[PDB]
Amino acid sequence: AYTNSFTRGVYYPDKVFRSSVLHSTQDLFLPFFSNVTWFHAIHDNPVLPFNDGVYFASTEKSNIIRGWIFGTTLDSKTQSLLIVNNATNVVIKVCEFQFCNDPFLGVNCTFEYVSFKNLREFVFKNIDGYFKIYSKHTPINLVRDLPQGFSALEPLVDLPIGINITRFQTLLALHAAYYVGYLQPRTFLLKYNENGTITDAVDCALDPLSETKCTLKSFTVEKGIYQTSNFRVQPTESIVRFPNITNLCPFGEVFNATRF
């Protein structure tokens, strides 16, 4: 099934402190009111393309989900990022594991590191060899679907791995639904409150009203008529025209030559 993304998928973009400021920046974010895939867990682990980053989400009641695998081929031919949290232990591995034919959990290595009522959200991205993972766990009271509201995403870990990830997979426990959304380069205007926490943001390209809000750099637009942008028709095809000649220029006649 499909679902409304609402206003989820917002994270702090940098490490600089700001307060009570409307700051505009372009960054890979989850476009507002987009479509996310609704996966079931009854009686389902396909291969999904990575595109330009992935927003991940889960709501948990029995800790079925325990690990993540990312890579390109996932057959011990290339390095694949593998993350497992077991009880109170966290393991990150970049070794070339020989995955089983159908990986599941019951109920040449260059890097190893060792450290519904609840909704936990993640954002996964790769920027200049930096693997950035953002996460937040929150208590909710809603079983039908995602609760409406806004919650900021804070960073915990950054890993300088450098893997070109195009496919991934989660780890389901087989004898807790989850959501997958895709990021895009959208400009955002974030409202930093007095305590440095982003409490509101607007999708700058969602609709003309948001365009006006971006132009005026405010959350309230007074009565009137405003100019916000310019419409221009884009070209459809390319036409290249050259004379119809076939004779070859005698460059070798001069570039060889016994004596100059």
């Binding site: 609709d207 003309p208 009203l209 365009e211 006006t212 309230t220 637009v221 007074e222 009565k223 009137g224 008529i225 405003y226 100019q227 916000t228 419409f231 028709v233």
Partner: peptide, 29 residues
């Protein structure tokens, strides 16, 4: 251009395309 009443009243807006015969793109010419 975006024609809008104040957000204190409603969020419904209208869009005006300046000085273009709008054949290429509830419309009032």
């Amino acid at each position: 251009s975006v024609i809008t009443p104040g957000t204190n009243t409603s969020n419904q807006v209208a869009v005006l395309y300046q000085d273009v015969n709008c054949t290429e793109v509830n419309v009032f010419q």
